[PDB]
């Protein structure tokens, strides 16, 4: 389960 978080100032993918 790949988690993709994109928003102003931050971007990452939680395990």
């Amino acid at each position: 389960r790949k988690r993709i978080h994109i928003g102003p100032g931050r971007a990452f993918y939680a395990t």
Partner: antibody
Amino acid sequence: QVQLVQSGGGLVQPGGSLRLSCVASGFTFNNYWMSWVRQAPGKGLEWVANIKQDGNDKYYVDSVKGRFTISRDNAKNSLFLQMNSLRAEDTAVYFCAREFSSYTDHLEYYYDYYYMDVWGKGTTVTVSS
Amino acid sequence: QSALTQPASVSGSPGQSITISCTGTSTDVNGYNYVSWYQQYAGKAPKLIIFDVSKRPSGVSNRFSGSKSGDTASLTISGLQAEDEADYHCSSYTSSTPYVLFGGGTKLTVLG
């Protein structure tokens, strides 16, 4: 209805400082990330800074890191922005906006995207020598 | 390395359709879908009208639609009305700080 009202704008000289306020109403403030976006006369928009719902995680655009400090007080539905070492290029209208989560889950993975759905009317900041 | 590009201005007459392009959005598969558009009337605050490339917040007219192919995002307005006259800004993801960009904005004029 949902509303956001900022204040604190004004005229200062290079190196001066200002403290912007933003009062929310009509929504659970401590559930959303809050941002500050600016617009220089006759130009487009530019995100300046935001803060997580727990007030810890803070992000800024590179040109203001060190000079600008964002903070919030969930107790009073308020968002703030302390501006120090102001420059001429910082001249613009400042808006505070709410970041909302657009969640789309496809099991193996999911997208958690944030966009600004609520905006205040904006407060003016002029920096001139 | 990154900067969204939308024409400074566009015109159209009542009843027609018009399109505003925005090159430079992300082609990264994980950020491809992060695209939005905001409408802004002179002196007023922006308003989200399209997010996730082509979704509409409730209340926004189905005359406004969004699409994307390659790195180019496109906003389309059909049956132009005098009240459609405003500034339109595209927003998109970018793999590096600040992660979310804005175009220069497009001034749409409705020849009234």
